[PDB]
Design a protein around this ligand. Structure first.
Ligand SMILES: OCC1=C[C@H](NC2CCCCC2)[C@H](O)[C@@H](O)[C@@H]1O[C@H]1O[C@H](CO)[C@@H](O)[C@H](O)[C@H]1O
Ligand SMILES: OCC1=C[C@H](NC2CCCCC2)[C@H](O)[C@@H](O)[C@@H]1O[C@H]1O[C@H](CO)[C@@H](O)[C@H](O)[C@H]1O
Lengths: 649, 649
């Protein structure tokens, strides 16, 4: 009982944890299945990929090619359809027609064994014809058999008849396959399209108040949705919406002690008004939330709720479930840290005393918000909770509600970010904000779209309430434009935190990535109408970007991405493709200085010969340009951060 | 039911084919088991490797360490004992005592929480005490427990009682391990030492004849073994010893037609005088072979036989089992090709008509030679036979006779060479002869001793009857010296084909790696006594080298090898280590010109601080040197090809 089959087929990728967790995909996504495929001796091998939908049904005949000569690595692109658990195998086989055609091309003109090789071809095309099921496809192949056998013709003419394109036609359709060897099935999990594609917008409802009641409510915040929808966003992510604690409530600018009307951080979940299943009374009731969810849905927006599995000391859990916390010998509970940060206002959950209780409560809490229209959750700080916990929770929820998308806010070491993705988290936050040079971007994106894409889906938020990167601080408005062009086109999921559009870039101090006067500890009213009137918002650019994404399916995917070399360190170029769609992007990473460069396009990667002109259209400017293997660009920051171009039919 | 455990243990290496084939080792070989290990939050993890011999017995406590900061990859070295099928797991755990000690060294001198931190520690040394079952070890920790709780002692003095190395012992002996998580078992296959370590000598028995009878016999050839054993070799590899066919027998110098007395290629196995189970009658009988095998053993030599699963057209199989061959439509059998080489004198075995029959006969043939003392098989050209055939045959033979070593002569693409190693082949031929620059050699060895060492064991033949590399052609005798030093110290198994020691370097043509007047097609008599008197043999160095290997266990293993930088392309340097043994080698790859260089030793890789003296002894000259972090060397071709140095304590 051998491990290797008749024709070796080994290391079928994609693979997640040696095959005991599923590789990932979404409806309509293309990705490449691959395998090492070879045989003993010198004869030709073929390989093909077999996709199975969740019922057993196989996909189209999908043949593979050797991906680089002499490597015996083969690949083919396959595409997932209906959501569910799929499977895929690679089949390998002896390819006798390629083997024979190769030998007949040398032996027949050399006059070697011409009578034997031609009868070999007759017998073998006859065999190819026994499986071809079309009467026309059959009779075509069998004519070549007779032409091979016609001794009244020169051998060169008899052989020629087995290589006419009408024979390659019938043969490409129904190939003759010897010694068919299958790999073991590998699991694929196909999820709804939002798992991979979508633009996210984060805002605090409490900041969208009125002059007479400054603390916003769901009813006042619902009026901010039209602006957000108009910018072309699909998901609206809310920070925790529940009662905020008062004990050790932080004051403005992350000061330890609050004051009389300091609002405190929404992540300090819990107070005697309720816990994670309740609404913060200054936002309104559970019906105010439904109104919000409904108004969001009407505009085409999906609500994503923040799940922070933690408590403020006033959460009812603190006394209702003391065993969900770790108490020091004096009975106090150390406040949470994500060092060097201190979270004095909240308690970390301990998991080893009553793991069943936390599991049951977590899914109850989540099913509660599920019942009210929440189908997406931004999981706060998952890497401080056990990995097997999220695995079990995501399984419970998805076993009944497979459409529920979880996003992992895991800024941490590469191991944990990867593991959390592989155990269930549909999307992941990334290091995107700390990749700002051409080389950092190229490296990270080469990886995220490389092998990582079989278990991770990146959500490129260009800012969060906790990350005001120095690139944006020092670059001003042209920095905010470049980073949005970058996030919206390098990932099929990107996002911004409210105030990005207004280019809010004042840090708490220098060397800090915190915001001065951070929204986390204060209401942050913003004059959206003034900013729009005065043109001091890049909301126009954010909108056209999500427009480009919605008209260009190349931008709705991640794995098909290629960087093109340019002769300036500050100028990056790259293209993505989906079928006939080819988007092509050139960004000036200098926020401060005009750059000009030669972008030397890798023409075959766009599907073109080395010398062809390319009709492109700069979807930001609407202008049209004619490019070739080398192209002069000039990008003036403030005027034009980048060209975002579709190739024209 | 989750995939990930409480404390994650992930991607445990070494692994072969996702765990469906065993990793390899030999009795007494050291190698590193490694794993990705981490946890949620900021407390410490520990991990250990649990190696199990074939009855289950677990090995010594083997704790692991993070291999680089922030990588979450952990490793520990394990050592194999008895032959058999072993298994190994990694356990990971929360390390609460390491976390507390970390907090106690910071908080206690600052005077922060001293009464709580000290009580946290007492309660926890109390917990380590419930697992120590000895009456004495318990009170040891409990005295630290009582001193930690001692209200009337200085805080610095209470902490000290939990940190005495007298307590570090009883804890390293019985560690407090929380939430112990295991990986699933991985299989390890431990083979006898000769599979990894040993020197080979290949020669043709028929070339050791008498003046009156030029075709040697086993009885005359047995007389050549004293020279071979004395040269320090362990294995004697004989080309096929069976009847040679006459149909299409090749003549001298690989000419297509023989003459009246051309002996033919020994690989043209088979005639009506017998096939693979029979002895070539010009060699003597099966009793002469017994005599030869027995006389070889007396000298400390093991016989390795060539197994070539193929036939001359006069083999009895050609008519007894036509189905083991591939027939053209007229019933003839195309002669074997390995393009561009043509082997007109032999037919390849075809495997798809009667695979059980070929298997049964194959293991029948091998058990015959096993019955006559042959426990090693050099499998000729395995990559022209199906991979699964070798898997099933090697499993079968080793299933009854686990000591039988197979060596695969597969010079081909890397995929095939890897798979044959992974399916059973104890040793592999390598690309060694085509790696002659410092960068080629370093690249290849970094690969062979890196991850490849978990499934392949290299046999560094510096020449074969089929590979006289141009390096040896153009370099002459100093080239032959350099490659022997290189082969004998870079691999624990190396070999030479007889005539190497006489520096036979005359090729078929320019641009060929074939031998002129190949022993493959003609008796090649050699005046061994004359060459030694005339000093035209490098047998002294071969002998010196094999002695150095036998006194220095660093040269009897493969994986511990490290390259040291030198400032001349032509001077390579490296060291190997096995326990206290450190061999350090500096070779001049220039065969024609004296090279001088500064060898800049990587002192930690030798186990020293950058300022230490290193007493070495040049095992080739007997000279003694005091070396350091940087060393000037001068190597003259002809006089000194290399330093091969042992370190002294
Ligand atoms: O829940 C903690 C939490 C985790 C998130 N993780 C960071 C760490 C890596 C860099 C970027 C994200 C973010 O801090 C943010 O979502 C959140 O913190 C906020 O809430 C706390 C509770 O009130 C306050 O104590 C704290 O000051 C305030 O910032
Ligand atoms: O057995 C096949 C074969 C393969 C081995 N593989 C080589 C080829 C690639 C580069 C170096 C290793 C070696 O050639 C050698 O063992 C063998 O060849 C010999 O056997 C044939 C049958 O008698 C003769 O026709 C031929 O003249 C003679 O040389």
């Amino acid at each position: 009982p051998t491990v290797v089959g008749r024709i070796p087929v080994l290391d079928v990728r994609p693979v997640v944890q040696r095959g005991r967790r599923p590789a990932k995909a979404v409806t309509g996504e293309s990705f490449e299945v691959s395998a090492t495929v070879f045989r003993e001796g010198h004869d030709a091998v073929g390989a093909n990929v077999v996709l199975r939908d969740p019922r057993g049904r196989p996909g189209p005949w999908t043949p593979m090619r050797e991906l680089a000569p002499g490597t015996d690595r083969w690949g083919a692109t396959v595409t997932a359809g209906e959501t569910g658990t799929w499977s895929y195998t690679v089949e390998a086989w002896g390819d006798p027609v390629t083997t024979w055609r190769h030998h007949a091309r040398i032996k027949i003109p050399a006059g070697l064994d011409t009578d034997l090789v031609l009868e070999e071809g007759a017998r073998l095309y006859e065999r190819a014809a026994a499986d071809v099921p079309g009467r026309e496809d059959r009779r075509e192949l069998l004519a070549a058999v007779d032409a091979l056998r016609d001794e009244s013709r020169p051998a060169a003419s008899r052989l020629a008849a087995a290589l006419t394109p009408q024979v390659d036609a019938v043969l490409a359709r129904h190939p003759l396959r010897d010694l068919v060897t299958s790999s073991d099935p590998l699991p694929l999990l196909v999820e709804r399209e939002r798992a991979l594609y979508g633009a996210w917008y984060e805002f605090f409802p409490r900041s969208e108040g009125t002059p007479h009641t400054p603390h916003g409510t769901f009813r006042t915040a619902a009026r901010r949705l039209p602006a957000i929808a108009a910018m072309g966003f699909d998901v609206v992510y809310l920070p925790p919406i529940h009662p905020i604690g008062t004990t050790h409530r932080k004051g403005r600018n992350n000061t330890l002690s609050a004051t009389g009307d300091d609002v405190g951080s929404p992540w300090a979940i819990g107070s005697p008004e309720g816990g994670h299943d309740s609404i913060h009374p200054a936002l309104g009731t559970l019906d105010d939330f439904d109104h919000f969810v409904t108004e969001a849905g009407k505009l085409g927006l999906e609500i994503a709720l923040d799940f922070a599995l933690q408590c403020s000391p006033d959460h009812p859990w603190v006394h209702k479930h003391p065993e969900w916390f770790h108490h020091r010998p004096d009975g106090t509970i150390a406040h949470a840290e994500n060092p060097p940060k201190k979270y004095q206002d909240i308690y970390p959950i301990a998991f080893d005393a009553d793991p069943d209780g936390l599991a049951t409560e977590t899914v109850r809490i989540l099913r509660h918000w599920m019942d009210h229209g929440v189908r997406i959750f931004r999981v706060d700080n998952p890497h401080t909770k056990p990995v097997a916990f999220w695995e079990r929770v995501i399984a419970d929820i998805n076993g009944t509600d497979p459409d529920v998308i979880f996003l992992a806010e895991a800024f941490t070491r590469p191991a944990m970010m990867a593991t959390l993705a592989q155990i269930g988290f549909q999307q992941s936050y990334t290091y995107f904000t700390w990749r700002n040079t051409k080389q950092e971007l190229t490296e990270y994106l080469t990886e995220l779209s490389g092998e990582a894409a079989s278990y991770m889906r990146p959500n490129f938020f260009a800012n969060t309430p906790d990350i005001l990167h120095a690139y944006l601080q020092h670059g001003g408005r042209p920095a905010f434009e470049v980073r949005a062009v970058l996030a919206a086109t390098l990932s099929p999921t990107w996002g911004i935190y409210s105030g990005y559009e207004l280019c809010e870039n004042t840090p708490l101090r220098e060397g800090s990535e915190e915001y001065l006067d951070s929204e986390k500890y204060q209401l942050k009213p913003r004059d959206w109408t003034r900013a729009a009137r005065e043109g001091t918002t890049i909301a126009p650019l954010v909108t056209r970007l999500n427009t480009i994404r919605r008209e260009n399916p190349a931008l709705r995917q991640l794995r098909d991405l290629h960087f093109h070399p340019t002769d300036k360190e500050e100028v990056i170029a790259y293209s993505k493709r989906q079928g006939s769609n080819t988007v092509l992007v050139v960004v000036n990473l200098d926020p401060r200085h005009t750059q000009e460069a030669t972008v030397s396009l890798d023409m075959p990667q766009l599907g073109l010969d080395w010398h062809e002109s390319v009709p492109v259209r700069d979807e930001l400017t609407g202008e049209t340009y004619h490019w070739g293997r080398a192209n002069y660009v000039r990008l003036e920051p403030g005027r034009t951060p980048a060209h975002v171009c579709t190739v024209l039919r």
